[PDB]
């Protein structure tokens, strides 16, 4: 939307970018004051205040302030500071609103004459731009739109000086005709290319020194920031003038800036009794329309909503804040909570109500004591289980929550809240049964959401011909037409969509705002397409008006942006209109009816389809246009096309506040163009030029001859009454019902709202990876480095799932550091040299080396633990353990060394020997290990504990001596073979080191020559 | 149970156009198991079916059977067979 700019920074960007032939003076002569600035800083940095006169004006978006007397006119340095005593920060009133005044703008006064004061204005319309100029300006313009000079400039058009001199400057000073028109040409490129919307300057001082601005007025679009972030810098649009914010109320806007969900909270009374918690965009202004109509303008407390697929935690916060705000003060007249809702397309009901059933559980105490009565009515995907649990939870807390389904009227519960009622070149036919369309963008769910609609209407052929996406290849995408598999091609360019299949006449775009425009301008060059509809949200208003010129001369109906889409039941459907198939079976949109409607937004569109489907035969053809400021098409273009369609027998209209559109329909029925039955309504009077309100639109349309509802609850009876009249003469024949084909839905969407089941394999209790942070066996990733444990620390977690303390973390890090590679002779490392010389790669030549860790190499760790852990826990004396073995064979594993045993240690078996001596209490095994050594070292000069033998017992002495492992994870983890895990993690780092050496030296293939083989083939066979 | 009476959907990975195994007879790429021995083709015949999915005629079935018969082992010197002696002596 066009957000108003604070006049300080718009004046900064004025002199920064505008370029003309005449001299623009006062470059960067701007100054700011607030109650939170001190006068010592701005007095020194900005020296041009203290030499001429100064003027001071409120930069807080108040209009016509010279006529209000809150401007500091023609004063000196300390003249404005004394003037800024009762105004800088204090309470004051302008118009109909009070509040503080904390911002003011300072610029030096430069004198002028009255004949050098000017008025200039440029504002944006749908059909072009006005440049609006008068040769005298200031605050004395008055009724200015009926006197100043006009010149219509169009979109994608440049401005000539020759029309300025002939039309614009015909009542202007002739001696100032150069300095006027050349400044206009500099502001025109300032206006057009930077996507401004409403610009006006008063007073524009064009003196004989040059051009000067004393005060500015600007409105720029906010949607074009994806192009204009880099040029505007960090542009800030402050809100308009008013009161200060409540503490929890602005806090919800901080949740609004978090996700794509758009949650808005606006009170009217801080202690009312009618409390609203409404889901949907167009639902919240219509419920509040029915509250002020029933007299509740005084005790209505809040109006707000939550949109943009609201999550649980974001609706847990939106719920729990306002139920905590409604229990600060009490009221003997009580309170009433309103929980409404429209037909949501694709989000679940009860999961979006899982937060509100939790937030009532936190403050169920005082919600009983404030004596509240709650109503709930909500529809969409599986609403009734959300209704059943919410009706149950009222009886648990003791408060009566009266539920309501989709069968009742939408605003009926506010009649039951306060007790008003008791509680029980174009085409004409756009789509057909033979229509085919092509979507843009990988949006396969909505393609599936379109394809199933063809199945329930029993259309003969599918409608989606191709998917145009330029960032993949050309292949065929699988879908499910009923139960079978169908192959829809995905294409890369738009011309190849035309070549094999030129029979497509409707083209759709589902891309985002950042690529919507280029996908459209190249499209309408191909004239075989007859209908284009745009869904994307965030489009600039110039890019909105750039598209309309091209289809005007060619004749393609645009149903463009901020649109959910349109429906022609029995024939064709655009987008996720209706949502999943539950609504399509609830309102019977698989066959036509006779009722047509046009609206702006989507939540109102499905609400008609609830109401009309229970009152008429069904819907014939209905389509929303969009909720932007500039709609793609007017209301008139379809309702005259409705007149040119024979199948409809009546026209229903839904109008909105703003825009002079419904008067054309009013003039359309006054000119006799409208002959069919017309029923209209304008939403949102809420009045608590006159051509923009809902008030005159409710009245001027009324005495043209239109059936007009007086409320929204009666809108069901208005269509009910007119349908009874249209069947009285028998022009609407009663259509028979034909039962539809039934379709399987999908899996992943069905399990998402949890209705089926599934058994689960794959236990895997390690390393949660989905979510936001990878949790390890007990810990997130970032918390590991805050304790800063080594990779022994993750070696505790990923293997043993206990927080292993960091005196032993350095042991198992030291443990694999000494069991590295052991030289290229050993039959483990000997394979991975061979598969290095054959030159495979790294990791297919690492795997040929870890295949040798078995029962005759390198698994001696496993024998040098289970020979000792048995013979100690069920153990015997040392000098019978050795006696038992040496009557059987079966030598003690982990013991035996060819080179250095006695009086000459291996110098690394003793390295571990002190590190297990210091930081290791309670060592039964290793002191039992050394006592098997001492008997044997006397027996032979060899037979010391090997490095594999000590680690066979130094690791089991790590387990049953440290904490967090009792006696059952200590023995089983040696039984599974996790002690082999120390080895083949250890020898793996050396094999690659063996490998990288064998590839740097660039060796050739090995052959192992014949003179060792000695073939022993037999005689003859 | 709910998929058995066919009401939900499921997308399908794992294309695998060979060797139907459920039912009563294992069908190969075009043929049940018992029909293979009635033509009585050799294991070159299944080497046509399981690799190329065409009924390869039996003048060339004996060729690809003869083709791997001459590309057997080539002596223990070669660096292919030299690894698998080593992992034999380690006794895995």
UniProtKB/Swiss-Prot annotation, chain A:
Keywords: Acetylation, ATP-binding, Cytoplasm, Isopeptide bond, Lipid biosynthesis, Lipid metabolism, Magnesium, Metal-binding, Nucleotide-binding, Phosphoprotein, Transferase, Ubl conjugation. Changing residue 478 to R/Q: Decreased acetylation and increased de novo lipid synthesis. Abolished ubiquitination by the BCR(KLHL25)complex. It comes from the Eukaryota. Its EC number is 2.3.3.8. GO terms for molecular function: ATP binding; ATP citrate synthase activity; metal ion binding. Signal peptide: none annotated. PROSITE patterns: SUCCINYL_COA_LIG_1 (PS01216), SUCCINYL_COA_LIG_2 (PS00399), SUCCINYL_COA_LIG_3 (PS01217). Its cofactor is Mg(2+). CoA binds at residues 701-711. The modification Phosphotyrosine is found at residues 130, 620. It holds the Pfam family Ligase_CoA. The modification N6-acetyllysine is found at residues 478, 484, 492, 870, 890, 900, 999. ATP binds at residues 57, 65-66, 108, 110, 117, 215. Mg(2+) binds at residues 256, 259, 261. Gene3D superfamilies: 3.30.470.110, Cytochrome P450-Terp, domain 2, NAD(P)-binding Rossmann-like Domain, Succinyl-CoA synthetase domains. It catalyses: oxaloacetate + acetyl-CoA + ADP + phosphate = citrate + ATP + CoA. In the N-terminal section; belongs to the succinate/malate CoA ligase beta subunit family. In the C-terminal section; belongs to the succinate/malate CoA ligase alpha subunit family. Homotetramer. This is ATP-citrate synthase.
């Amino acid at each position: 939307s066009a957000k108003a700019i604070s006049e300080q920074t718009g004046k900064e960007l004025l002199y920064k970018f505008i370029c003309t032939t005449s001299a623009i003076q006062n470059r960067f002569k701007y100054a700011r004051v607030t109650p939170d600035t001190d006068w010592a800083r701005l007095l020194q940095d900005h020296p041009w205040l203290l030499s001429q006169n100064l003027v001071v004006k409120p930069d807080q978006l108040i209009k016509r302030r010279g006529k209000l007397g809150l401007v500091g006119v023609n004063l000196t340095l300390d003249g404005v500071k004394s003037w800024l005593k009762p105004r800088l920060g204090q309470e004051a009133t302008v118009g109909k609103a009070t509040g503080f005044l904390k911002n003011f703008l300072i610029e030096p006064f430069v004198p002028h004459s009255q004949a050098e004061e000017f008025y200039v204005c440029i504002y944006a319309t749908r059909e072009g731009d006005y440049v609006l100029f008068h040769h005298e300006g200031g605050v004395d313009v008055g009724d200015v739109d009926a006197k100043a000079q006009k010149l219509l400039v169009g979109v994608d058009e440049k401005l000539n000086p020759e029309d300025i001199k002939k039309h614009l400057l015909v009542h202007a000073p002739e001696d100032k005709k150069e300095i006027l028109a050349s400044f206009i040409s500099g502001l025109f490129n300032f206006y057009e290319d930077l996507y401004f919307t409403y610009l006006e300057i008063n007073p524009l001082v064009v003196t004989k020194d040059g051009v000067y601005v004393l005060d500015l007025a600007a409105k720029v679009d906010a949607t074009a920031d994806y192009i204009c972030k880099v040029k505007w810098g960090d542009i800030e649009f402050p809100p308009p003038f008013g009161r200060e914010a409540y503490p929890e109320e602005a806090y919800i806007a901080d949740l609004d800036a978090k996700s794509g969900a758009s949650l808005k909270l606006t009170l009217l009374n801080p202690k009312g009794r009618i409390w609203t918690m409404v889901a949907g965009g167009g639902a919240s202004v219509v419920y509040s329309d029915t509250i002020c109509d029933l007299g509740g303008v005084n005790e209505l407390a809040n109006y707000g909503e939550y949109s943009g697929a609201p999550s649980e935690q974001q609706t847990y916060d939106y719920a729990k804040t306002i139920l905590s705000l409604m229990t600060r003060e009490k009221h003997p007249d009580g309170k009433i909570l309103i929980i409404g809702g429209s037909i949501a397309n694709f989000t679940n009901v009860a999961a979006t109500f899982k937060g509100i059933v939790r937030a009532i559980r936190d403050y169920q105490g005082p919600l009983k004591e404030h004596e509240v009565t709650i109503f709930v009515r909500r529809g969409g995907p599986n609403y009734q289980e959300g209704l059943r649990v919410m009706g149950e939870v009222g009886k648990t807390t003791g408060i009566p929550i009266h539920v309501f389904g989709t069968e009742t009227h939408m605003t009926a519960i506010v009649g039951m809240a306060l007790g008003h009622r008791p509680i029980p070149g174009k085409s004409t036919t756009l789509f057909s049964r033979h229509t085919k369309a092509i979507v843009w963008g990988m949006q396969t769910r909505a393609v599936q959401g379109m394809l199933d609609f063809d199945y329930v209407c029993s259309r003969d052929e599918p409608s989606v011909a191709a998917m145009v996406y330029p960032f993949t290849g050309d292949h065929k995408q699988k879908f499910y037409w009923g139960h079978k598999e169908i192959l829809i091609p995905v294409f890369k360019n738009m011309a190849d969509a035309m070549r094999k299949h030129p029979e497509v006449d409707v083209l759709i775009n589902f891309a985002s705002l950042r690529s919507a425009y280029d996908s459209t301008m190249e499209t309408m060059n191909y004239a075989q397409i007859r209908t284009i509809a745009i869904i994307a949200e965030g489009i600039p208003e110039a890019l909105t008006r750039k598209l309309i010129k091209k289809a005007d001369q060619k004749g393609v109906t645009i149903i463009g942006p901020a649109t959910v889409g349109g429906i022609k039941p029995g024939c064709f459907k655009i987008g996720n209109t209706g949502g999943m198939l539950d609504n399509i079976l609830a309102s019977k949109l698989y066959r036509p009816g006779s009722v047509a409607y046009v609206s702006r937004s989507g939540g109102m569109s499905n609400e008609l389809n609830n109401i009309i489907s229970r009152t008429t035969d069904g819907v014939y053809e209905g389509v929303a246009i969009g909720g932007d400021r500039y709609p793609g098409s007017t209301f008139m273009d379809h309702v005259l096309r409705y007149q040119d369609t024979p199948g409809v027998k009546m026209i229903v209209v839904l109008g909105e506040i703003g825009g002079t559109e419904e008067y054309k329909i009013c003039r359309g029925i006054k000119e006799g163009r409208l002959t069919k039955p017309i029923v209209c309504w304008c939403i949102g009077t809420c009045a608590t030029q006159a051509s923009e309100t809902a008030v005159a639109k409710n009245q001027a349309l009324k005495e043209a001859g239109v059936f007009v509802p007086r409320s929204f609850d009666e809108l069901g009876e208005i269509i009910q009454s007119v349908y009874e009249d249209l069947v009285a003469n028998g022009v609407i024949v009663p259509a028979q019902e034909v039962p539809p084909p039934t379709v399987p839905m999908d899996y992943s969407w069905a399990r998402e709202l949890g209705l089926i089941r599934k058994p689960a394999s794959f236990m895997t209790s390690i390393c949660d990876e989905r979510g936001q942070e990878l949790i390890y066996a007990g810990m997130p990733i970032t918390e590991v480095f805050k304790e800063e444990m080594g990779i022994g620390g993750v070696l505790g977690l990923l293997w043993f799932q206990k927080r292993l303390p960091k005196y032993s973390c350095q042991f198992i890090e030291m443990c694999l550091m000494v069991t590295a590679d052991h030289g290229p002779a050993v039959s483990g490392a000997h394979n991975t040299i061979i598969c290095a010389r054959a030159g495979k790669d790294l990791v297919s030549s690492l795997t040929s080396g870890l295949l040798t860790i078995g029962d005759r190499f390198g698994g001696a760790l496993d024998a040098a633990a289970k020979m000792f852990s048995k013979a100690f826990d069920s153990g015997i004396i040392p000098m019978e353990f050795v006696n038992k073995m040496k009557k059987e064979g079966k030598l003690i594993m982990g013991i035996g060394h060819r080179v250095k045993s006695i009086n000459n240690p291996d110098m690394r078996v003793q390295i571990l020997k002190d590190y297990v001596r210091q930081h290791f209490p309670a060592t039964p095994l290793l002191d039992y290990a050394l006592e098997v050594e001492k008997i044997t070292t006397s027996k032979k000069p060899n037979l010391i504990l090997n490095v594999d033998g000590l680690i066979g017992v130094a690791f089991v002495d790590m387990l049953r001596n440290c904490g967090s492992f009792t006696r059952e994870e200590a023995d089983e983890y040696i039984d599974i073979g996790a002690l082999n895990g120390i080895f083949v993690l250890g020898r793996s780092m050396g094999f690659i080191g063996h490998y990288l050496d064998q590839k740097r030296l660039k060796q050739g293939l090995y052959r192992h020559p014949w003179d060792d083989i000695s073939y022993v083939l037999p005689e003859h066979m």
